Amino acid sequence: GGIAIYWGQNGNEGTLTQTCSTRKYSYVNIAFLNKFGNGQTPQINLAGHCNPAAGGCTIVSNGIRSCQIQGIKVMLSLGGGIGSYTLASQADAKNVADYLWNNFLGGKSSSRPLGDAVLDGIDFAIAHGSTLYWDDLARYLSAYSKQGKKVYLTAAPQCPFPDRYLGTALNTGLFDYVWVQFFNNPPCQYSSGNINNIINSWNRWTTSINAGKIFLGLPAAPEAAGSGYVPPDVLISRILPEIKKSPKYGGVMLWSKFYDDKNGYSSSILDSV
Numbered sequence: 001g002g003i004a005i006y007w008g009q010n011g012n013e014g015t016l017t018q019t020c021s022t023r024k025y026s027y028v029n030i031a032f033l034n035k036f037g038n039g040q041t042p043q044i045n046l047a048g049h050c051n052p053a054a055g056g057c058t059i060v061s062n063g064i065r066s067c068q069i070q071g072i073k074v075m076l077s078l079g080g081g082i083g084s085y086t087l088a089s090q091a092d093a094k095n096v097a098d099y100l101w102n103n104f105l106g107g108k109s110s111s112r113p114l115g116d117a118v119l120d121g122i123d124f125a126i127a128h129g130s131t132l133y134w135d136d137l138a139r140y141l142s143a144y145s146k147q148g149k150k151v152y153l154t155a156a157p158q159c160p161f162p163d164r165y166l167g168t169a170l171n172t173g174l175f176d177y178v179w180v181q182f183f184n185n186p187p188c189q190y191s192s193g194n195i196n197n198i199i200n201s202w203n204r205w206t207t208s209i210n211a212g213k214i215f216l217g218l219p220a221a222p223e224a225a226g227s228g229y230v231p232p233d234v235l236i237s238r239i240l241p242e243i244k245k246s247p248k249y250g251g252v253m254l255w256s257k258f259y260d261d262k263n264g265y266s267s268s269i270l271d272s273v
């Protein structure tokens with residue numbers, strides 16, 4: 001399989017161009033568009049990388065195309081752990097979809113936050129707020145594919161199945177890639193000497209949802225999360241041999257680029273994924 005990486009939440013993790021030139025990642029999620037819905041003007045947060053005002057982040061388009069010519073798919077991640085994002089109604093879902101289409105996808109806008117580059121898809125990292133209308137947002141976005149260029153749909157649900165916020169949306173069967181986050185969740189993450197909970201959870205996910213491929217989401221370093229870190233050796237000799245047997249296995253997802261560099265996680269597991 002391949003490795004999916006989240007980029008954008010630490011200005012010291014390097015440019016998007018550097019990230020893709022490592023040749024270690026197959027998918028890159030730009031985190032995060034953490035503010036939208038309920039009448040709010042959508043706002044993207046890329047930590048210290050750039051300030052979106054006055055097109056301060058339009059420079060990212062260079063990184064996006066650079067990744068894409070290498071065959072790497074780039075998605076804009078909605079939500080994240082911090083933000084006042086939500087959907088107040090079905091109409092709100094439509095408004096946000098149209099916004100995303102004109103500002104990040106194949107539409108037209110005179111103020112595209114990240115530039116004129118056209119992203120491959122939208123990533124759903126909804127962790128709190130409203131539990132409604134996310135399935136509508138998925139449908140409206142998916143409908144734009146009929147205009148020519150496919151809009152990829154990906155999701156990053158928490159490992160407890162079913163997911164309180166993305167369960168309905170994932171049931172639509174419209175998602176291409178799903179990277180389940182097997183961390184910050186005691187009942188389905190790794191615990192020293194115990195891989196039972198994570199394997200049990202994996203089998204539930206790979207047999208319960210209709211998606212293209214499912215990825216094992218993990219923290220790239222002990223500091224990347226409150227709990228759930230899996231040493232590279234344990235992943236390679238105990239977890240991967242089991243989960244790779246599933247025909248739905250797509251690879252591994254890591255949070256995040258910044259911590260991957262410090263811990264050299266992807267460098268240690270790349271050939272085994």
Ligand SMILES: CC(=O)N[C@@H]1[C@@H](O)[C@H](O[C@@H]2O[C@H](CO)[C@@H](O[C@@H]3O[C@H](CO)[C@@H](O[C@@H]4O[C@H](CO)[C@@H](O)[C@H](O)[C@H]4NC(C)=O)[C@H](O)[C@H]3NC(C)=O)[C@H](O)[C@H]2NC(C)=O)[C@@H](CO)O[C@H]1O
Nearest residue numbers: 009010011034045047048080081082125156223224225226
């Ligand atoms: C897919 C998913 O759901 N992932 C979860 C992660 O979101 C979560 O990791 C934490 O994510 C939040 C964002 O949601 C992130 O917060 C960011 O923190 C950085 C560093 O402090 C801030 O960057 C600064 O921003 C200011 C102004 O914006 C700049 O002036 C300053 O220069 C920046 N500093 C640096 C060093 O760049 C961001 O502003 C802030 N983002 C937001 C939206 O407020 C946390 O840092 C992430 N925590 C960790 C440990 O990475 C993860 C937690 O384990 O869980 C995932 O599931």
